[model samples]
Every structure is written in structure tokens, then in C-alpha cells.
Target chain A: SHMQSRELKTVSADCKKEAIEKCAQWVVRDCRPFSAVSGSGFIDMIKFFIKVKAEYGEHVNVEELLPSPITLSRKVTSDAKEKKALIGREIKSAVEKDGASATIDLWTDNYIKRNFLGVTLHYHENNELRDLILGLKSLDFERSTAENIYKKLKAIFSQFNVEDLSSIKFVTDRGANVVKSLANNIRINCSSHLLSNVLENSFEETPELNMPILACKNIVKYFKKANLQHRLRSSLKSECPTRWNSTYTMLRSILDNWESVIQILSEAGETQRIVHINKSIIQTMVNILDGFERIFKELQTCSSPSLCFVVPSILKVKEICSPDVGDVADIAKLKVNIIKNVRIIWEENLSIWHYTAFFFYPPALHMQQEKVAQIKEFCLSKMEDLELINRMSSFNELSATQLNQDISTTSFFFPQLTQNNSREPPVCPSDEFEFYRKEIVILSEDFKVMEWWNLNSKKYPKLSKLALSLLSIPASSAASERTFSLAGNIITEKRNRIGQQTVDSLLFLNSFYKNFCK
Target chain B: SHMQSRELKTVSADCKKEAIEKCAQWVVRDCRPFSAVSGSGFIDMIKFFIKVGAEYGDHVNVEELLPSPITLSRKVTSDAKEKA
Candidate 1:
């Protein structure tokens, strides 16, 4: 048996550049001074990396702020509850002004055999598109039927002192149970989920395409091993079966280092079978990925309002997904197929609600006067009571304003939402919509329709209220999906036993900062 | 070209020992937990702070001598340990 010992070989500047191939003894010596690296502000950073974390022990008693491990865990729950009451008031105030739009999704963590339900609350408060992660509740969605979901969701709303789920537009994936959960009310299917389905289904029949993707997935899985990571400088991304855009990202990264990947795969010897990829198929997919990538990216905007972009983006997807003039035979056929799929999903999801959102926004304004007036008439037909807003604004201030003031953890959440459950007279909308349509719009490069409404809401109170409520709705339920993404990191194997409430509280605390994270 | 080698200057052993004792005293007094002093991570941490204090102390060889967690645990109980 032979033992291997490590040795260092430093490559000096221009050392290996020569006419000869042999390495026995080549004349090459033009070494730079070792201090050359230390001359700049560069070498100072290495020791600096060690300094920040370590130096705290000398000057300050870090233990004063840092409780014991036992205390830290309980403190997470305790600190998080204080934040919850504060956000509770904020939620009531916002939801009452313009009703909220909610997005819910179910995710299952395969590792811990735990399933999670993520509910995100969105509302347009002031000029900003405000969104909050309302629940990362741990529940088994497999057993959660439509009725089960409906009851649990209503219970969560009541717990937060928001009376009814029927008041807002409920957005979720087109799961059978989830659809039925809000079957009695208005439901909008998530646009992102539908786009992903179109992408997956269109590629279903093409094994020529499938062969390369399977091989690409295999290559990503192979490189995912610990040792092979060093072979490529950047990590290659893998695809989730549900996320079509991740597959686009996967293909792009593989295509980024095409020659390097081919050589590495061949050199590794085991993955020689997947080394040969169809260049034409991969290149053609770029066209397909480009067509699908833009609007899905557009819809996933959690920070600003997303609902206004939906009807246009859906039509945009179809317009782009149609076969281009330069397309090859199979790809052209496939593009048409994908557009067919896109059209099918677009049919059921089309509503005057989205069209009114499209028409109401200043930046998105355009239509036949005849067409828009019909939707405007639809908008005027369904506006709600203002006295209800008085109790709500009163209760929210009492809750938003009062929850703004003081309470214990249990007492803060019970905002006594007894009012407005009785009944109401319909709010009459003005003829100001005719003036709104005739007006020149807020069409600037860096403007939100929200800014226009913020400045002009008082001028057209009913129209502004309806516009803000409709505009606040998100096009995708990805906010809930992204909460599960946070859960992926927070519930690690080492930190495996963190109870559902602790995890929820930690994530609830995270929502304020992580709005900018995605 | 004259400024070379990773350790810029040698640090005095007297000053190095002085800072470490202060760190240990703070840990024992402010923090009651004694099991933190050992482990490769904590050792690296102590050496890092020592290196930082001695960055301009000339090329200090960051060779360190820190108390073990077992020693630290005993040090906290020494007054009681001696009586027992």
C-alpha cells in the first residue's frame, strides 16, 4: 500500500508558457515580490474577516444581551408575539381602508414529513403596495379538503380580528380542494402556476426535448456531489418538477459552460453517456424560455402590485409563445402547442375584475369607451358600505390604533370583531369614472398607478377605493411559496425540532426585512 | 517589496498573555457557562482576536496558549473545589 502526502506547487507568472511540452526543466523565472499582494487594501481584509466577530468579547459583555440557549429559544416566541400585535393593528387598518387580497399555497417538506400552509395578506395602504405573510401554519393539506381549508382560513382571519374571507379576492393555485375552499366567493387562480403548467405540458410529448432535459437534470444531479463542485467554478442549478423557470435557469447555466461541461463530463468518465447534448434543441429552448421567462418574472413581483399586470401578461405570453418566423420545425410546432395551452388557461381566469384592474390603473389605461364602460358599470354595481368602514377604521384603529397601543400576547389578537357582521346598504359610485377615463394617465417610466391614486383618491373617492382594492391583488401566490422557501433554511436538520409556532413566529418576524429579499 | 511574510511583526509574549487573561476573566465573570473555552472553533476565535490586537505588533507568530474548557470549568469552582 502506498501513502499519499500533500505538496504545494506555486505557479509563478508566465512560468509554463514555452515552446516545449516536457516539464523536466524549463527555463522560467520572472517571479513577482510576495509583498506585491500585501501592498494594496486587499491583504488587510483577510485578518479583518477574523477581527469583527472575535473582538467583541474584549470590550463588551456580549452575555448581557445574549441570553442562554434555553432563553434564546423562548425569546424568539416572546419577541415575535410583540411584533405580531403591532402588525395586527397595521393589518386591520390597511385591510379596512381597501379590502385585502390573499394568496395561499401548500408545501410539503419531504425531509421532516411535515406539510405547511402559507397565507399572504396584501393590501394597498397609502401609495405603497403593502403585503404581509399572514400565516405559515403547519397543517396537512392532504387531509385539508375545501371545507377544511375554508374553516381554517376563516378561523385565522377571525383570530387576527378580520371578520370575513368573503370580503376579498382569494388567490391560490387551481388545486381542487383549494378551489372549492373559496367556492362560495370570488377566486382567481395564480398566474405563475398556470404558466408553469403550460411549460411542462407543452414539453410533455417531445422526448427529443425530454432526452436533453433529462440528461441536463442528470448532469446537474451528478455535479451536485461534493467533490465535483470544484470542477466547475460556479454551481450548476437544478430544476424542481413544479417550477418550469428553474428548468430554464438550469439549462442556461449548463449552456453557459457548454464546452467546459462536455470536457468535464468526459474526464469524469462515469457521466460519458450524457456528455453529448443536442445543441439545436438546447438553443431552441432559449427562445421558448425567453418567451415564458419575462412575464412569469413580471408576475412574481411581491413588493409592488401584481394584479394589474395579469390580463396583459397572459395575452403577452400568448403573443410571444406563438411560432416566430425564424423557428425550426419542431420548435414552431411546439410554440403553437404551448400557446394553445396558454389560451386554455387564460379562458377560465379572464374576468372583468382583472379588466377593470387593467382599465383603472393610470399606466395600464386603454380601451374602447364602449368596452371599458361596461366594466366600469360592473365596478359600480358591486361597491360596499361606508358605515362598515367607520366601524372597521374605528375597530382597526381600536385594533390597528389600539393594537398600536398595548396588550398581552393573547389579549392583543382578540380585537372583538363583532360589528359589521349584521348587514349593509350598497355604496353608490359616482359618474367620475367617465372623467377618469377621459383624463390623460400617469404614464411614466418609474411610476405606479398607486402614486396617481394616492394623489387623487379624495377627488374620486369611490373609484379610488375600488381601484386600490383591485390593484392590491397579486397575480401569483408565490408569496406563500416563498415563505416555504424561508422554512427550508429555518427548519434545518440540526434545528429539526423547532415547533410549528416557533417557526411561524420566526418567519413572521422575518417578513418585514425579507420583503426586499426576493 | 520589503513588506512580506503573512505575520507582519512579532508580538510581545507579555502583552499577548495580558489580553488573554482579561478575555478569560470577562468570560468567567460575565458568562457563567464554562464549556465554551474549548473546541477548534473557539480556539480559532481566540487566536483571531489575539492576531487582531497584534496586527501592528510586528510579525507575531500568533502561537497561542488558552485554557481548556475543562480547566475553565474547574477555575470557576476552584474556591469551592479547594475547600471541598
Candidate 2:
């Protein structure tokens, strides 16, 4: 164990060095895929390693480790093969070790594996001779012991007739020919490769103001690196004991909120002339501040009563830390207009009738013969039971509170999803509503539309990959990439690492632009 | 054209029946799964379906001009998706 630990430590050091080196190559302005698009925040770090391996052509590389300690899922599908493996005694052991276990979970479920060498084993419960797709440990994987283990798992599963090999998908960056040829073709859901697809493509499509944001990251990283920002962060925190966690949130906040963050930084910059504060960053900040002024100004002037319903919601975020609040911008607020737009399309109420109205289903796309047969079978077999329908619908209604809470919490309480307002409606249109200007009102209060899109296209850790697969690359990736360079200048090991809440605040300043069109 | 018409008629009749069946399956998926995370809804549907399929199978098969009306294929199509 000691030897293994030492080897892992050596591996980690090398891995960190390689990761930092490769991350440098990916920040090239146009050469990078997501540089133009929105900020993905910390999920970007996981993506960075995945991209490095793909770009350099090393497929089966480990991405970043999960932040929290991992545990096993308790819910194992009950079957002879898996059940034998997960009997009460074994389950007790697993729980004692990891405190929990999951049964019959998808690979996407977090906490399935957490050890240094993550155990990627899954047993399929079905009646068939299943094929096990195993990932070999060695880089020379074509002839590794991992192949032998796959053979063993397959035989064990087949002997019991409890392996649903067809359903299991095994994706790795390694060559598939060896595993594919072994009777059961192991399907691949290549994590690193899929992630590269996103980093290189999909997430880049989302519009994010990039230039200024990247500049802010660099300026902060640089000043922090140079000891100036470090001193400022320290002096501010020391002077005001209340703002300890304030600097951490604001570090990236500047990208989304450049107008305000820049107001502070540029003042600081003028007082202390730093070298990396480039023209693009200054110009972009100016444009963003101007745009911020325009959005608020237009919103103030907006006179549509019915459309005016969104004003309260629009004014809802950052109520505590905003300038309107007594005078502490330290707490920070994440602008959710991006996500708000995503939610508009598929809101449940809108789904029932709204979709049926605009949607034109062709003969093929419409419920065809096979579908109709199933529906009939399902209804007579199931839905015909009024009791069943009522019960299920009731449960769904109960769960709705949780799901509804998540949507609003992401917008109002930031990404933590902890804070919620139970009394508030799914959407709150402001008192500044005006009925006559319906078109203008509709335009201004389209957060439902924004929120709809956000949920519809949620890729979580790999937004870029989904976009690339769908061939819908956008502009936010650019902003993220540019911000990486700026971050190179701003966030450093020495100054701002331990205690700086202003990172998000400052980053927001770099990203938010003046023109809504931009 | 004859084949197409034949298929359509067969399909439509199948659909009418299948829609009813799919709703049942949905209840099962929605309810039975929750039995572990929960325990109501489909606990009854499971009992109900096993009884209905066993009891009404002969009558429905004769009326529909098919051997098994409640069979998997006759019951529901896997085409549509729920909000999940």
C-alpha cells in the first residue's frame, strides 16, 4: 500500500505538470473552440484534462478527481449474479467502507467510483451471454491483463444467464478492436473524447463577451501573481472582517459582471499602473458598463404592463449584495438571464398545449402503428386503472416542488441551489408592467424563454461535447478561452489562492458587455 | 395501396387499444419504480394488470380478432417519451 501510494504521488506530480503544460496550449484565441463562448466555471478544469489527452492523442486518460469523497450506490438490481455479489454481508462491508452503495445506476451517476484507481465495474442483470468491454491499464492495451479480466467476467455472467451485455455501453479513449473482436462488442461512451467534442465545439456557440473577461482573469492573476492584487485582497479583508468569503465568489464574477468589477479594478489600476491591463480589456469593460447602463435604462423606461411582469424577477437577483443594498458588493450575484432564456421553451404548462399548437407531426413522426399498438396495450394494461393514474399524478405533483425549486434557485440564489422561496411563483412578473406595449413587454420579460433553453440544453460537465455532437457550436467558449489568458494574469498561487471572494465579481466585469447585440 | 390501407386500419385499431395499454405501462414505470423510493400507485396496478390480463384475455382476444391483445407489442409503442 505504501509503495502504491508513493507511485501514485509520483504519478500525480507528473500528471499535474502535464496538465498545466497542456492547458497552456489550449488558450490560443481562435485556435481554441470554446474561447469565444460562455464561462463554464470549475467544470472547465475537468474538461481541460479530457481535451489535453484528446488533442495530444492519449485516449484513456483520467480527468480531474471529484471534489467530494466518493461512495458506492446501494441500489443493485436484484438478480442471481449481481445479488450473489451484493449479499447482505458484502453490502454491509461496502457501506462500512464507503458509507453507502447504489443499485442499478447509470454510469453518469456521480459517486460510483472515488478511489485513486477508480473501479469501473458494472454487472448487467438479464438473460443472455453478455460481452464485457474492459479498459486495459497499460498504454500498450492491445495485449493487457484487462482483456483476461473481461473474458472472466463474461464467462461468469453467461454461466448464470444474467448478463444483459447489449445494454451496457463501455466508452474509453483506448483502441476497441481487441475488446470488440471478443464476441461481445463493448459499446463505448468515451468520456474524454466526448468532453473534447464539447470543449472543441458545442459550448462555444453560447454568446459570452470574451475579450474583457479573459483580460480580467489575466489582470487579476497577474496582479495576484505580482503581489499587488494579493495585497489589495488581504488589506480589504483585514480591514473588513465580514468579507472573508467575498473575494472567492467575485474572482469569476467579474467576467459576467465587468461593469461593476471594472469600476473598482480600473480605479485600482489607475492608482497602481499594471502592465498586462491591455487595451482590449479596457475597451471591452467600457462597452460592457455602457451596455449594463443601457439594459437597466431600457428596463426602467419599459412601459408594457402585462410584459412588465418580468421586472420584479429581473430585479430579483443580487438584492442583498447589489449597490441598491446598503453597500457591500462582496456577497456577489450570478446573472441567470442565460439560463432563464433556456427555460422558456419547455415549461410544463407550455408543453401541454403550446407544443401541440405549433408542432406539425408528419405521418412517420406522429404516433404510427407500432406506437399506437403500444399505447393501447399500455392504456388497457395500465392507464385504464383510474386509481393508478391518480396515484402517479399525485406523486408527480409532490415531486414538482423540488424540481420547480431547482429552476428558480439556480436563477435567484446562484448555482448552489440551496436557497429557495416557497411563497414565490414559478415566475414573477414585476409591478412595472404595462399592457399597451405587449410586444415590448414580451421582449423584455422573456426570461421564461431563456430559462427554458438553459434546461433543454443542459450538458452539465460537458456542454461543449453535446453541442459538437449536435453540430451547434456557439460563442461562449471563446469568452472562456480568453478568460483563461486573463486568469493566467490574475489568479496566482501566492496572493489570492487562500482567501479571495472577488474573483467571480471581477471576472463578471470582464464578460458582461454594453451591447445586447454583442 | 391495399397493403397500406390494411396496415393503417390494423395500426389505428391497435393504437386505440395500445394508448390504453401505454398509459398502464407508464403508470407501472412511474408507480412501481417509486415503490422502492416509494410504495403506492403501481403496487395496486401490478395486482390489477396481473388480474385483468389473466381474466379478460380470452374475451378481448376474441373481440379484437387477435390471439393476444394484452401482449407487449399489442399493448404499447416505445416511441413516445415522458417528461423524465
Candidate 3:
């Protein structure tokens, strides 16, 4: 304590010197000490303390406020620490003077959800009160803050007949155990949050839908790769330079027309003999590609200022694919599986079946069957020359594991899912169910898409069942992103500059703050 | 035994005065308080007393720093009583 007082005394002298130097209009630099405001902000804090002390009395206690932790200007670290220690010293000094006492409550809200994590008080408040405060506050993302505010108000309450204990409540966003703890006290949960959860669950049902959506992402990612995009741009320029002017829109157009895209490349005169087309995807690709090109050409001449259109371009393509918007059920009913999941959509609603058909499961099982048959035919074509290519290899000689590895490793051909083989035969019954669950199970261990679907018409009924189940559930985290805009207001300028403690204190003080938090 | 005699002898009035003046130098920021008491337990002890005097001696007592298991109901002291 003596050491702290001594530092405080020295700081006062430094502040005096700074105030003098600052007024002198002289620069304190290497040439000479520039009169520039060295520790000017600290000087302001010092002045505030002096003014507060002078107005009250030297014997009274005063608090030195600090800025929010994450945003604190680094220049004030030691200065802030010194000011805090000085406050502790003064709080101690007040107790000795006139037999009155004071306490320094160093409150901080720097944890998740800004629950008070640290608080300390000097001699004026007893150890019991300190323990109570810490117990109620530490690591508390909820109750700690409310409790601290309650403690402060209770301190004031000790002086007043204030009947409304409800005045100091700490209403917060979302629900937490703290709500139960502070019910009669000044804490409540935001009402809007309850509605948000209702929206979240409504979007979660279509697990199957996400797979094809993911495939869309992979296709986008493929075209977006640095070299790939560059290659695609150059390829398009060489293939059709008139198309060169439309480079940015090309990836989405390709995605919209993905089925035809793969087909065009797979059946490229030279590629037919080298890289055989997966026949199942080829047809779907053709439809997607045909719709995509029609929309791209229409959009190419549409009211757009540039060649590229945003995701909304997918909207135009969607119309071209299915012009009758009211026939969503028919489109949902007749849509093929391969390219449907990857359809670019822009509805405010992103529920699985709402925008993506894969989520619609048992999705037009016939189309899926036909696509699988194409995959099977392509697989056989590769097998036709496999024995000659691998010398000792015969089609039957290959093991299921080897064959599955060969198929799934073509990550380019398959979707970029988590590193797991989708083509591999089921090792366990659970595995068997999982494989069959996606409607790919009947595509036998070595079964290509077509063969699997050919032999599995009876199973089409099950795929439809899965699709029905997906349509029923709807939950997504889109709101989490949407609500992020609220963060800016919760952290504003005057309060933004304050340390998180003061911000929490301000938050605790303002009942309106809770509305902005959610 | 000699050093014991030195301690047993009450602090000389003159030395006490000089010690107060030396401490004042630290309190006034003329010398580094930590360096003044470095490696000297006796000086450190004096520094503690000086700290308590400069700080809590005015209002609160040294006892406030000690642990207390007591829990008191909220009540206003004289200054707080009227401020209410």
C-alpha cells in the first residue's frame, strides 16, 4: 500500500508536469521535449479524478474508469494499471481518514456473453461481501452481471426506501439458468429469441437435401479454384471468346447448366475414348446445361449492365427450367436427383425441400434410377479396358474395397464431402442402412448408377419415404448470421470506448439494451 | 547478543525522526520506495507501517485487511443515514 501511494504521488507530479508541458506549446522530442500530448488521455482521467475529489473532499473515495478490454488503446496499459492501484490506495486512505471507509469494486465483463468474470473490493467492503460478489459473478455469462447490478443497487437501496426492486433487473438475450435465478429480481429474457428457435427447427428436416446442395458448393468451389477459374476463363476464351466478356457469370451458369457441362466435356470427341461419360449424370447435366445456357443467353441480353449475374441468375434459370412457378409440386415430383440438389436458389426461406429437391427424397425415383443406370454404363465402359490397362487385372479380380476406392477417389467426379468413401459396400448393417438410406444402396457394391436403379424399383418406395421425412423438418442457422447486425449497436461509440465492465454496467443499467442484444 | 541489544534498545528518538524524514522522501517521490527497502526486512517493515499510515490510517484500521467470517445485515452508517 505504501508503494502504491508513493507511485500515486509520483504520478500526480508527472501529470502536473505533463499539463504544464502541454500548455507550454513546446515539442518534447530528440531535438527537445515535444509539448505533444504524451499521456494526454491519462491526463484527462487524472483531471476527472481531481475534479471529483475537489468537489467532494480529499477524504472521499473516487473510481478511475477504464475502457473496454478488447478495444483498449495499448498506450494506456501501465497508466490504467497505475490509476487502478491508486484508486485502491485512496479507498484505503479514506478508511483511515475521519474513520469513514470506501471500497473499490473492479468489475469486468470479458467472458462469453459478458458475464462478470472479475471483481475486487478493498477495505471498505468486508471479505464476506467480496466473497458473495465473486461467487455470484465469476465466469457467469448471465447471473453474475445481474447479481453485480443488484449488489450496487442494493447498496443504494440500503440508503433508500425505493419500493421497486424491479428497477435494477438485468434482462438478457436468449435463455440461460440465470433467468430462473433472477426472476423476481431485475433479469428477463428477450421475447424475440423464442420466436427465433421456432424458425430454426423448421429448416432442419431434409438431411438428404444438404448432400446435393453440398455438391453444388463443390461444383462452385471447383470453378472458383484459383487455377481452375483461370483455366476456365482461358478455356472459355479459346472455346468461345464471345463468352469471354462474361467470365464472372460463367461459374454460376456452369452450375445451372452443370449436367450438360459434364456431358459436353465427357462426350468431347477426344474425351469419349479417354474419359468416358457417367451416362446417368450426362442426361441430368444436359437438362441443367440446356436450362443454364438458355438463361445465360437470356440474361446475357437482359437488363444486366455486366455479363455476370449474381445468385439471382439462378432464379432466371429456375424459371427457364420450370416456367410454371405454381407447379412446385410437379417440379418437386418430376425433378431428377443428380443436378437438382445443386440448384442455386435465392428465396428468403432456405428450407431443404423448399429450395432444394434432394431434401424432397424419393425425389422422382425414376429419374434417379435412370441416372444410376448411366453411372453403371460408364463404370462398365471403364471396366471394358481395365484388364488391358492394369495387366494382371480382370474386372472380376478387383476387390470391392479397391473398386470403391477407385470410384470415390475421383473427388472431381464425386462431391467434395468429408473424406469418406460413398461407393464402398456396407461393412455393418448400420452401414448398409446408411448407404441404402440415400437411395444409392441398390447400386450394388460394384453397381453403377443405372444397374443399381434397374434392379431396385421396389426400393424406390423407400426413397420417397425418406424424402417425405425430410420435408417435415425445417431448421437452419441463417438467423444466426442475420442477427449478427445487432452486435454493432450493442457496442456503440461512447460505450464502445469504455472497457467491457463499464459497458456491462451500462448494459445492466439500460433496460432497452436487451432488445438490441438479440 | 549485540544485535539483540540493538533491537532491545528502543528506537532512538533522533533515528525515528530521521527514519520519518527518509520515508517522507519516498512518499514525496524523491527516491524509489522499493529500492530503499530492498534486502532490508527492517526497512520493509517500516515501509508497511508507512503504507498503512498513508492509506488506511486515516479512516479504516489495519484489521480490515484481515479475514472476517461475519455477515452483517445492510444498514447505513451516519454519513449514509442522512444521505438516504
Identify the leading candidate in terms of lDDT. Answer: 1
Interface RMSD of each: 18.9, 28.6, 20.8
Determine which window of 10 residues in candidate 2 chain A has minimal summed lDDT.
Answer: A65-74
DockQ scores of all models, one per candidate: 0.03, 0.01, 0.01
For candidate 3 chain A, the 10 contiguous residues with the lowest summed lDDT are A126-135
List the candidates' TM-scores in order: 0.64, 0.21, 0.20
lDDT agreement of model 3 with the native? 0.29
Query: What's the TM for model 3?
Result: 0.20
Docking class of 3: incorrect
Q: How would you encode candidate 3's per-residue C-alpha lDDT over B11-70 as one tens digit per residue?
A: 335534443333322211211111222223322222233333343233322222211212
Alpha-carbon DockQ of candidate 1: 0.03
Give TM-scores of the second chain, every candidate. 0.35, 0.24, 0.27
Question: With candidate 2 superimposed using the best TM-score fit, by how many Å does residue A59's alpha carbon deviate from the native?
Answer: 61
* lDDT by residue (tens digit), candidate 3, A151-261: 654443232222233323232333233344355653322212222222122212233333333444444465465234443332232111121222224434554465554
Name the regions of candidate 1 deviating beyond 4 angstroms: A1-65, A96-98, A205-277, A367-374, A384-430, A480-483, A513-518, B1-84
How far residue B50's Cα lies from its native spot in candidate 3, in Å, is 48
Q: Per-candidate TM-score, first chain only?
A: 0.71, 0.22, 0.21
Candidate order (lDDT): 1, 3, 2
lDDT at A46, model 1: 23
CA RMSD, predictions in order = 16.3, 31.3, 31.9
